[PDB]
Amino acid sequence: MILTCPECASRYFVDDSKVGPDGRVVRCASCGNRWTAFKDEAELELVPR
Ligand SMILES: [Zn+2]
Numbered sequence: 361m362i363l364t365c366p367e368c369a370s371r372y373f374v375d376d377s378k379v380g381p382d383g384r385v386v387r388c389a390s391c392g393n394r395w396t397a398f399k400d401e402a403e404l405e406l407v408p409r
Contacts, residue, residue: 361375361376361379361400361401363397367393368390368391372388372389376399376401379397379398379399380399383397383398383399384396384397
């Protein structure tokens, strides 16, 4: 999965295990900013995986 920094305005990637449907906090590698992230890669119903 990938997330965008509110400050760097740039994308950064992490494993899908780093976030769940309940959400999880993350940290920027470029400015140390922090915010809550959420999953969408498998949030849909009847998902095959
Ligand atoms: Zn940043």
